[PDB]
Design a protein around this ligand. Structure first.
Ligand code: OF6
Length: 118
């Protein structure tokens, strides 16, 4: 009974502030955990720049843009894609950032997305 998409406002974290630097130890686990933390409001976003991914833990969970129209209410439509050892699980659009657990770090901005749950 989950609606297919949910509007979320994600805290954007600087990489050196992140305390828990990934969601788990396999592709399937990190996708599962990321979805749980999104549902619970305990998921942050790190914008990818040079130096960022080597300071985070693989497998990575990205949010990627899933369509070019719409963006209803200022929320870019996105979906989850995981990466391990240079192989991606999912194909989608441009990366908005890498998801990490949020455990109370102070963000620098909030990023509004319309997330495809599955
Ligand atoms: C505070 N977030 C709002 C919310 C409500 S239901 C929900 C959700 C349910 C299943 C999978 C995912 Cl990825 C998200 N998120």
């Amino acid at each position: 009974m989950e609606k297919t998409h949910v509007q979320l406002s994600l805290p954007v974290l600087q990489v050196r502030d992140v305390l828990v630097r990934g969601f788990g130890d396999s592709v399937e686990e990190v996708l599962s955990e990321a979805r749980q933390h999104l549902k619970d409001g305990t998921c942050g976003l790190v914008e990818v720049e040079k130096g960022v991914l080597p300071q985070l833990e693989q497998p990575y969970v990205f949010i990627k843009r899933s369509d070019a129209r719409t963006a209803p209410h200022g929320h870019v439509m996105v979906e989850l894609v995981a990466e391990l050892e240079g192989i991606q699980y999912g194909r989608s659009g441009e990366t908005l950032g890498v998801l990490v657990p949020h455990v109370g770090e102070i963000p620098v901005a909030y990023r509004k997305v319309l997330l495809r749950k599955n």
